[PDB]
Amino acid sequence: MLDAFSRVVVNSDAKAAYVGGSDLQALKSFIADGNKRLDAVNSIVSNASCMVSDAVSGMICENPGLISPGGNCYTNRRMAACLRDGEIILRYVSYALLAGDASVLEDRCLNGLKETYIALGVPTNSSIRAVSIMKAQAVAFITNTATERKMSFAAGDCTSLASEVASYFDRVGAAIS
């Protein structure tokens, strides 16, 4: 896996180039905004259980066929696996946000997942809706605009971090579409 810094390193190494002042402004800002990134990750991890629960429940209340017989969440064993996958995906999205790079998500979570869900009969479209709901939740928490819970922050702009986490959630559906 790479993080924001080692991403730059990889790109520089492809040109046999040193990383110098001209190349570092983005990483100096990454550092200077690093407390906000830590807060954004805290805001997700601290609500992760409610996020996964509410997103998978939301997927099902919108498409109740998923819990009919033959539905892919029918039985406790299936519903538990689904909830388990929701938590795994959120976990990898949280690592990508902590690292400022998607590689951990793409490499360790998304690689092979489409073929797996195809093999198992896991509906990739319902999966994308669960992931979109968690996207909606995560942006709300990062910007402290969730309706049902607020947390504590020094006031400031976390637009970029919310856009970034959204991009990592969007990667999941891209991978499995």
Partner 1 sequence: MKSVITTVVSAADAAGRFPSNSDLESIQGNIQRSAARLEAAEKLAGNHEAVVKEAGDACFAKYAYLKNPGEAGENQEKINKCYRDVDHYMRLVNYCLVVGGTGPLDEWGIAGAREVYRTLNLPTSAYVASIAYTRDRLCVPRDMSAQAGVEFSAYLDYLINALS
Place of tokens 């046999």: 16
Which residues make Cβ contacts (< 8 Å) with residue 130, sequence separation at least 6? Answer: 55, 56, 58, 59, 82, 86
Query: Rounded to the nearest whole angstrom, what is the least distance from the CB of residue 115 to partner 1 in the complex?
Result: 21
Place of tokens 């996207």: 135
Residue type (1 letter), 52 = V
Query: Rounded to the nearest whole angstrom, what is the least distance from the CB of residue 44 to ligand PEB in the complex?
Result: 10
CA count, 13 A, side-chain hemisphere, 60: 17
Helix (H, G, I), strand (E, B) or coil at 62: helix
CA count, 13 A, side-chain hemisphere, 87: 12
How many CB atoms lie under 10 A from the CB of residue 8? 18
Nearest to 89 by CA among 1, 5, 176: 176
Per-residue contact string for residues 70-89; x = within reach of its own copies by CB under 8 A: x-------------------
11 is in an annotated binding site: no
Q: Yes or no: say if 109 and 92 are a contact pair by the CB < 8 Å rule.
A: yes
Complex with its own copies: residue 15 or 77, whichever CB lies closer: 15
Which of 16, 119, 154, 155 touches partner 1 by CB under 8 A? 16
73 is in an annotated binding site: no
Q: Does 119 bind its own copies (CB under 8 A)?
A: no
86 is in an annotated binding site: yes
Q: Does 166 bind partner 1 (CB under 8 A)?
A: no
Nearest to 5 by CA among 71, 79, 100: 100
Q: Does 116 bind partner 1 (CB under 8 A)?
A: no
83 is in an annotated binding site: yes
Q: Binding site for (2R,3E)-phycocyanobilin: what residues are annotated?
A: 35, 39, 72, 77, 82-88, 158
Q: Binding site: what residues are annotated?
A: 35, 39, 72, 77, 82-88, 158
> By the criterion CB under 8 A, which residues form the site for partner 1?
1-3, 5-6, 8-10, 12-13, 16, 18-21, 24, 27-28, 31, 34-35, 38, 41-42, 45, 48-49, 52-53, 57, 75-81, 83-84, 91, 94-95, 98-100, 104, 108
